[PDB]
Amino acid sequence: EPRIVTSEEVIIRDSLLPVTLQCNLTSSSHTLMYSYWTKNGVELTATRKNASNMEYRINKPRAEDSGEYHCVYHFVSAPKANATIEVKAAPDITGHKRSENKNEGQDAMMYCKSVGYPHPEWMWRKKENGVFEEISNSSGRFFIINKENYTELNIVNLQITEDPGEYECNATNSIGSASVSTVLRVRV
Numbered sequence: 001e002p003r004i005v006t007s008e009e010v011i012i013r014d015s016l017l018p019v020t021l022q023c024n025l026t027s028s029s030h031t032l033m034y035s036y037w038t039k040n041g042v043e044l045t046a047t048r049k050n051a052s053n054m055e056y057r058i059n060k061p062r063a064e065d066s067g068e069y070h071c072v073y074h075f076v077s078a079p080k081a082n083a084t085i086e087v088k089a090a091p092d093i094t095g096h097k098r099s100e101n102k103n104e105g106q107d108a109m110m111y112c113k114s115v116g117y118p119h120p121e122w123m124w125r126k127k128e129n130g131v132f133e134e135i136s137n138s139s140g141r142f143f144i145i146n147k148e149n150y151t152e153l154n155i156v157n158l159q160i161t162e163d164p165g166e167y168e169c170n171a172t173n174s175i176g177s178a179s180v181s182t183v184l185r186v187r188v
């Protein structure tokens, strides 16, 4: 039963300083065939080395670099072993609609996509009087689909009096928040 010690959980705050992840194989009854690093379940490029003490350097760390990292140890004649290091960052919203123009009675569809771990929670707001406030569904016309890295707001039966304006999506996790906005224009 092999033993692996790791460096501590990493919280990314900005992109200046590199961050280094470490795993040390501290006990083994089997010869090491090789060890590598994975990120979010996928092997990282050129990390396969035959070293008990592994390091992974993240240069210019960003939200894209966050996730669950594993140092994996493949043994000759024995099952693999791994340990986990979490690298956390504030969300980054990577996709949205800048604007949407629809007709009265049609449906509006707005969305946002994020990168960052832990996956964010999402909220939609509308800008009124310079302040982004919570969206009322008193009308029953607002539908929100929230996934881990994606949110979607649908507004059915568009009304030109009430619906136009600036809508923003806010992605929040324990590290921080990000938001972007979409302008909705209703016509006809």
Ligand SMILES: *[C@@H]1O[C@H](CO)[C@@H](O)[C@H](O)[C@H]1NC(C)=O
Pocket: 005, 006, 007, 008, 022, 023, 024, 053
């Ligand atoms: C890994 O082992 C080397 C000792 O050569 C040391 O620099 C480092 O502190 C160790 N890392 C951890 C997480 O124990």
Ligand SMILES: *[C@@H]1O[C@H](CO)[C@@H](O)[C@H](O)[C@H]1NC(C)=O
Pocket: 137, 139, 140, 141, 142, 143, 144
């Ligand atoms: C808005 O109200 C309708 C009817 O209760 C419901 O289908 C829908 O899920 C609500 N939207 C949200 C964001 O809760």
